[PDB]
Amino acid sequence: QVQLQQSGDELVKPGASVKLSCTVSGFNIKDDFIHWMKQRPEQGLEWIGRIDPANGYTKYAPKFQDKATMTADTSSNTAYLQLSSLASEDAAVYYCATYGVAYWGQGTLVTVSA
Amino acid sequence: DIVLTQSPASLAVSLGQRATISCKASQSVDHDGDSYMNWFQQKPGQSPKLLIYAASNLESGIPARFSGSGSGTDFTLNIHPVEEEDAATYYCQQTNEDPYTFGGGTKLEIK
Amino acid sequence: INNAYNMSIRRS
């Protein structure tokens, strides 16, 4: 019943910021964390952090504490991931997940070049 | 962080045979009688798919050819019999302590 | 009955 629809792929310039979205259907996001994961090209998975959309509380993995900003809009059941000061190691596929970590979005590819 | 070490990193198995993947944690992933270890399958260009959660629970929609065992710091995924569609990269993940962490992956190929 | 919302992450 639950689907997570992520925003489209983005090519971004070094130094710039970008905001990704994750629109959830079939599930009230007030009722669970949304988690964000990073996967660098051909590499493994990293957890970025989670947000509790009901109260806006966030917990980040320390390496993303200054890179990522998570927000959520309960009215549109949508979660956002903002990445700042982009650099080449930020190029990756970014995933959102919820229902514990059972259901995942299709990912958003971010590439970084200029 | 809890460091997860997956073994082997590459696994070649014949169709019909049994594949076994191991995940060793640097600290316990148990809390109050529950083990917080998950296993994911990922095919190229696709999102990771949850197979097993809480070490041994089979996720809805996943066939019983997949099974999970272990507790504490040592966990195992078994796949049998292996079929063509099992060729994929598999990841273990713990969700006991922050930050959540993943193993480095095991690529399962058909021999 | 086991459920991934309850058990795929540790909740506190």
Side-chain angles (χ1 to χ4, degrees), chain A residues 1-2 4-114, chain B residues 1-23 25-111, chain C residues 2-12:
Chain A
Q1 293 280 318
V2 185
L4 295 82
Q5 171 71 26
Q6 289 185 245
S7 52
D9 299 345
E10 296 267 337
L11 167 62
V12 306
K13 292 186 182 306
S17 166
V18 67
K19 188 189 234 173
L20 314 184
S21 67
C22 175
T23 307
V24 180
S25 56
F27 190 83
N28 183 332
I29 64 177
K30 279 174 196 169
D31 293 347
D32 200 3
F33 302 107
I34 293 166
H35 304 261
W36 289 88
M37 270 71 51
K38 176 184 190 181
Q39 185 166 39
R40 285 190 71 251
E42 290 84 52
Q43 311 304 304
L45 294 165
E46 311 172 71
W47 180 85
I48 293 163
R50 61 186 175 260
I51 180 167
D52 180 340
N55 54 25
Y57 160 88
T58 55
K59 178 72 175 282
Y60 302 91
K63 76 177 288 188
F64 299 103
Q65 183 56 61
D66 298 323
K67 173 64 55 173
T69 308
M70 296 178 289
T71 49
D73 180 67
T74 53
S75 287
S76 58
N77 277 305
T78 298
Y80 300 92
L81 174 66
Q82 183 176 48
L83 304 166
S84 55
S85 213
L86 286 150
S88 52
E89 49 278 22
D90 295 319
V93 174
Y94 291 82
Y95 293 101
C96 55
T98 196
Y99 202 88
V101 290
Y103 304 137
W104 292 47
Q106 86 276 11
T108 293
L109 177 67
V110 171
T111 49
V112 174
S113 88
Chain B
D1 320 334
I2 300 181
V3 176
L4 303 190
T5 299
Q6 248 174 274
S7 173
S10 171
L11 180 47
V13 179
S14 296
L15 246 41
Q17 296 295 303
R18 173 160 59 91
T20 305
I21 301 175
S22 165
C23 185
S26 68
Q27 293 135 58
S28 181
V29 311
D30 296 348
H31 190 74
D32 290 335
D34 302 283
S35 288
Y36 290 97
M37 183 70 74
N38 302 324
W39 291 95
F40 291 89
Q41 178 189 74
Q42 184 182 36
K43 297 185 185 175
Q46 300 184 13
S47 310
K49 166 176 199 179
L50 182 67
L51 298 173
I52 302 279
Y53 61 96
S56 58
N57 300 117
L58 185 65
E59 171 61 354
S60 178
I62 305 299
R65 300 187 298 104
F66 293 91
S67 69
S69 58
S71 61
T73 56
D74 306 316
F75 296 85
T76 309
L77 178 71
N78 270 279
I79 308 168
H80 72 99
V82 169
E83 305 184 350
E84 291 277 26
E85 76 271 6
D86 300 335
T89 293
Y90 294 84
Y91 296 94
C92 55
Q93 183 206 33
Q94 67 83 26
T95 57
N96 186 39
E97 300 283 352
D98 299 333
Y100 301 169
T101 49
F102 294 86
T106 290
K107 186 176 173 172
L108 178 50
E109 296 184 328
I110 308 303
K111 197 160 57 185
Chain C
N2 291 302
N3 169 272
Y5 172 100
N6 293 324
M7 305 175 307
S8 62
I9 63 162
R10 175 182 152 184
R11 297 183 181 274
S12 76

